[PDB]
Ligand binder design. Structure first.
Ligand code: ATP
Length: 213
């Protein structure tokens, strides 16, 4: 149906819009890409939906999908102007990517990162917003951290619950900026020999959507 977009995202701890009324351009909105940089990195690699290859002559929003039962809307506001995911699949060498199976309700992907302010190894998570929140004890405010607490849980909860909370509708999308010097050059984590933290980390925020116009 029609175009779609994100509309609502939770990044400020308080929703406060996040779509530029009158018409969609960057009229007066700053780039400032800190939270956005992460919310475009995770959002890229940690995706399964694609635009069935690229495009012959025709719009991103009327390609098709290929993908699995999560969403494609997660990607419809990435490949538009945020970056080639079909490229970043190979840009990042893809260290390890623990499956969720049916207990975990989260996935991980470690990955390297050659470029930008990101450490040479990082980690990214996706999965059910609550089941992430279990470990997730920070949140990311305009490139800064904040400590999560019962109050920041509340802010998350009432947001998440406004957005859906039904099933697969809201996802979590978090990361971890791992150390360079204090981690191994051999990227030797494995899935057996983990050695990586799975704790407070950095929640980043909710890449939720809308569906009615
Ligand atoms: N690619 C994905 N990456 C991460 N999480 C995803 C992805 N696609 C869907 N999810 C997750 O699917 C997971 C499984 O929970 P879900 O409620 O879907 O189980 P189910 O097996 O369908 O349950 P039921 O047996 O009741 O139908 C949830 O963690 C949800 O976040």
């Amino acid at each position: 149906q029609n175009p779609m977009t994100v509309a609502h995202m939770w990044f400020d701890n308080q929703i406060h819009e996040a779509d530029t009324t009158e018409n969609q351009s960057g009229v007066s909105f700053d780039k400032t890409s800190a939270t956005w940089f992460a919310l475009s990195r995770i959002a890229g690699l940690c995706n399964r939906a694609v635009f069935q290859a690229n495009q012959e002559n025709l719009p991103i929003l009327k390609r098709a999908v290929a993908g699995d039962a999560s969403e494609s809307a997660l990607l419809k506001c990435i490949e538009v102007c945020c970056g080639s995911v079909m490229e970043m699949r190979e840009k990042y060498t893809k260290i390890v990517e623990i499956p969720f199976n049916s207990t975990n309700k989260y996935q991980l992907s470690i990955h390297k990162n050659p470029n930008a302010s990101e450490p040479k190894h990082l980690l990214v998570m996706k999965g059910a917003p609550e089941r992430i929140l279990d470990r997730c004890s920070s949140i990311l405010l305009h490139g800064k951290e904040q400590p999560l607490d019962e109050e920041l849980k509340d802010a998350f909860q009432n947001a998440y619950l406004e957005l859906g909370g039904l099933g697969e509708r809201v996802l979590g999308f978090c990361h971890l900026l791992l150390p360079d010097e204090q981690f191994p050059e051999g990227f030797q984590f494995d899935t057996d020999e983990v050695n990586f933290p799975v704790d407070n980390l950095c929640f980043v925020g909710l890449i939720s959507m809308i569906d009615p116009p």
